[PDB]
Ligand binder design. Structure first.
Ligand SMILES: *[C@@H]1O[C@H](CO)[C@@H](O[C@@H]2O[C@H](CO)[C@@H](O)[C@H](O)[C@H]2NC(C)=O)[C@H](O)[C@H]1NC(C)=O
Lengths: 39, 49
């Protein structure tokens, strides 16, 4: 599992790597409960 | 006639000192023996062997 990240600018930079040995299937973005956002 | 190349006069060798060992022998020689169904993986990096 590779993951890049960027704080300033559009091009990203390497952040970390992780080995799991399994195939990822799904992903989900959970909502945020607030009173006072896009993904 | 044929070509020629300038022969080197020295040699540059650069390595990172004071680096720990990979101790791969301790990983292979362990009492806990894995199984071919649930084999694991260990990554050795930034060390000497
Ligand atoms: C052999 O493998 C075992 C794993 O089953 C190693 O035990 C781990 O040791 C590390 C420290 O190096 C601990 O952080 C882990 O919690 C241990 N896992 C356990 C107790 O399940 C062991 O170090 C390896 N080497 C030897 C010589 O036994």
């Amino acid at each position: 599992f590779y993951a890049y990240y960027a704080d300033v600018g559009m091009p990203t930079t390497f952040l970390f790597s992780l080995y799991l040995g399994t195939i990822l299937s799904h992903y989900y973005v959970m909502p945020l409960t607030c009173n006072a956002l896009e993904y | 006639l044929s070509g020629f190349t300038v022969k080197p006069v020295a040699t540059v060798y650069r390595r990172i000192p004071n680096l720990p060992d990979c101790d791969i022998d301790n990983w292979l020689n362990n009492v806990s023996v894995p199984s071919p169904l649930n084999w694991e993986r260990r990554i050795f990096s930034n060390c000497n062997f």
